[PDB]
Write a protein that binds this ligand. Structure first.
Ligand SMILES: [Fe+2]
Ligand SMILES: [Fe+2]
Ligand SMILES: [Fe+2]
Ligand SMILES: [Fe+2]
Ligand SMILES: [Fe+2]
Ligand SMILES: [Fe+2]
Lengths: 190, 190
């Protein structure tokens, strides 16, 4: 049925506004991560930004047109060091999957918008993993485990694919000569 | 010392030519993978192409200028189905790390170009993992295990980050509504 005048319509636009701002913030944090020498983390911020773009697109497509007024609070800034940005991003994700989306979903169900409610709940699942990545990386930075581990393992250069075996990533990739910043733990998800 | 007139100079240009062609082929295969409904594989081809660009750049930077004639054989085509493209790509990687680069490295060492030899050997390591990825994915396609597994596991939508728990990826992402093609096994390499 029509969304016109419902609370859900307002919530969808509110979510769209938040998703849109999150996309920008994450792209900026991605640039900062690159400056801080964390390439894997930089690419993660960029990918997360692209995924927020997709959450926003799904939400945007439900709307039926016209200008709508919304009242909501948003993070006024800021761009800091990568660890701080990861912590702030995780807090944003946390609010979305623990408070905002579950609430929007419940209201949607109550107003009779089952599909939309399902979408809100589904987006919340995505935000929870987004938070996991951000928290895990923040923890790695705090513990000094981004480029060094206790036991020998495999490290992959994101720039050229070189694989290094050892307790930590090398200062310079022996293949492409790029800095340690480009290394990540070798992952196999297939 | 100067590379002028050495066999290594010729080998570097030969490698550069091969690296350059590999970059193009992989980007085309990436596009084909997208058409075949394999997003993770498509992005892998694209990433591999970018890494070949970096192998080529390292090699290119060693050269000292001027036009040089080379004699070498290259794959004249072709673009086929994704499984076939993965197999062909793996064969290309195989020749590079088992025959070409080790040979170029040995010749470089013999002519007194230790740094260059180290680079050839290092690039070979990258190509071996490139082959592993291609062979693994080819195997997944052949066995019908790209989107379905024996035991329940976690699947991530590359488009929006939604996480699905089950034996196989869903036909449609419940969050962004994109097709099964966007799903991959949830990976955590950090
Ligand atoms: Fe989002
Ligand atoms: Fe998110
Ligand atoms: Fe590298
Ligand atoms: Fe290469
Ligand atoms: Fe390769
Ligand atoms: Fe999705």
């Amino acid at each position: 049925k029509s969304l016109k005048g419902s609370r859900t319509e307002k919530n969808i636009l509110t979510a769209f506004a938040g998703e849109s701002q999150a996309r920008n913030r994450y792209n900026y944090f991605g640039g900062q991560a690159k400056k801080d020498g964390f390439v894997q983390i930089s690419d993660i911020f960029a990918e997360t930004a692209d995924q927020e773009r997709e959450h926003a697109k799904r939400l945007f497509k439900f709307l039926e047109g016209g200008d709508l007024e919304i009242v909501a609070a948003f993070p006024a800034g800021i761009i800091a060091d990568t660890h701080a940005n990861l912590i702030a991003s995780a807090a944003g994700e946390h609010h979305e999957y623990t408070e905002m989306y579950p609430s929007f979903a419940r209201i949607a169900r109550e107003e009779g918008y089952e599909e939309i409610a399902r979408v809100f709940a589904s987006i919340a699942v995505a935000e929870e993993f987004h938070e996991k990545r951000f928290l895990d990386f923040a923890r790695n930075i705090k513990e000094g485990r981004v480029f060094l581990r206790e036991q020998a393992t495999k490290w992959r250069c994101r720039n050229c694919g070189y694989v290094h075996e050892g307790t930590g990533a090398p200062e310079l990739c022996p293949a492409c000569a790029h800095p340690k910043a480009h290394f990540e733990l070798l992952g196999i998800n297939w």
